[PDB]
């Protein structure tokens, strides 16, 4: 295994700095691997940001973002980081970290391992935590669900029975209200005989606000 995962604030204010780390597993940050950052403005396509050469610590950026940021590698935590100053609304994107596969010329163009991605939102607005409500059946035939109201920024993550459920779960993409706040809903299709025989609970986590909650879909 080689694994990468992004970390960082989900919200940044205009003309702050946005910082992200990528934690590396299974290989040394010094192994000479073009530790690369890429962003995807949502539904608007990929942009290459830059790289750190693992074994020299030299770095280079996109000619739009050089003169405004740096990328660096931490030998103590085995991770690499993007610091991108003077943040603007345009900097709102999913940020990905990646590995340029060993010993290619320009391996930052040929990225074999990628991280999950982290959405970073640049806004003068405030974080707001979700309001969480259950959805329960008689009025849809076999489905339970949950509703996650008027939160900001994106995202919120949801699980059922503390990860005891994966099969038959489906969590819907959010919708943006005119208020700038989002909301979404989650469902699980349950074998109808189980209602009240088995307990059903949803776990919810809007980490940009540190809001973690659990809710009973109490039949």
């Amino acid at each position: 295994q080689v694994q990468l995962q992004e970390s960082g604030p989900g919200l940044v204010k205009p003309s702050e700095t946005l910082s992200l780390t990528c934690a590396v597993s299974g290989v040394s940050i010094n192994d000479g691997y073009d530790w690369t950052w890429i962003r995807q403005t949502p539904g608007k396509g990929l942009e290459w940001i830059g790289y750190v050469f693992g074994r020299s610590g030299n770095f280079n950026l996109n000619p739009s973002l050089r003169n405004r940021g740096i990328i660096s590698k931490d030998t103590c935590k085995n991770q690499f980081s993007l610091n991108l100053n003077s943040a603007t609304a345009a900097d709102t994107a999913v940020y990905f970290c990646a590995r340029g596969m060993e010993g290619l010329f320009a391996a930052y163009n040929s990225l074999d391992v990628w991280g999950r991605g982290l959405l970073v939102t640049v806004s003068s607005a405030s974080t707001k935590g979700p309001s969480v409500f259950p959805l329960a059946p008689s009025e849809s035939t076999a489905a339970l669900g949950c509703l996650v109201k008027d939160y900001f920024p994106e995202p919120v993550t949801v699980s059922w029975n503390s990860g005891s459920l994966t099969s038959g779960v489906h969590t819907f993409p959010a919708v943006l209200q005119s208020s700038g706040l989002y909301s979404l809903s989650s469902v699980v299709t349950v074998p109808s005989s189980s209602l009240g025989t088995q307990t059903y609970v949803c776990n919810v986590n809007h980490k940009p606000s540190n809001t973690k909650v659990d809710k009973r879909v109490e039949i």
Binding site: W114, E139, V175, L176, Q177
Partner: protein, 211 residues
């Protein structure tokens, strides 16, 4: 950017050429191109590196080429599993790389399906704060365009509504959702509300009422 066609389409079992046109100082000068496959809401997968090579476990059905300042991906033996956005990238002069604007591959002739619509009322826990919402969830449909409208007591509602742009599931079918946002008086005013969803001219309707 490098330039790609915004979209391309092809029938099952066929082969498709996806092209990326740059300039002499990127695609031309350097034999360093690559292709990425992206399913929605997920990280890109590397598909070809250099003009020609494949990573391990990437299928034999993928191949790469370059002529002059232009380069292309061939996908052969189309499955619906090949439905994705495809991005090109190339090394660019003095320690850069450049991406192409992306292209969306549509795999034609997939089996159609009309939506498994689900509908829920406000929670009693919600309307105790004297605000109330109806949740209509639209799942497992293809093609991906839907018409959707609400009714109060069998009459059309044109304010207090929001609806998603549809989204592809793991299985290549679409999901969407619609929400109606009300006060408790406006929930209580009507003995039933309905969400009506029309897909390929066929209509699914789901109905809800207090208790």
């Amino acid at each position: 950017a490098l330039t790609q066609p915004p979209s391309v389409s092809g029938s099952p079992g066929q082969s498709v050429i996806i092209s990326c046109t740059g300039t002499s100082s990127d695609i031309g000068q350097y034999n360093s191109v690559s292709w990425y496959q992206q399913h929605p809401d997920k990280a890109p997968k590397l598909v070809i590196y250099g003009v020609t090579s494949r990573p391990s476990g990437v299928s034999d059905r993928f191949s790469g080429s370059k002529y002059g300042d232009t380069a292309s991906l061939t996908i052969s033996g189309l499955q619906a599993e090949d439905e994705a956005d495809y991005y090109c990238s190339s090394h660019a002069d003095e320690n850069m790389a450049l991406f192409g604007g992306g292209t969306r591959l549509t795999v034609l002739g997939q089996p159609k399906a009309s939506p498994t619509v689900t509908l829920f009322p406000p929670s009693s826990e919600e309307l105790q704060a004297n605000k109330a919402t109806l949740v209509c969830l639209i799942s497992d449909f293809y093609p991906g365009v839907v018409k959707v409208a609400w009714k109060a007591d069998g009459s059309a509602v044109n304010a207090g509504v929001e609806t998603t742009t549809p989204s592809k599931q793991s299985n290549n079918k679409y999901a969407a959702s619609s929400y109606l946002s009300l006060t408790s008086d406006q929930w209580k005013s009507h003995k039933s509300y309905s969400c009506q969803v029309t897909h390929e001219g066929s209509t699914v309707e789901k109905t809800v009422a207090p208790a």
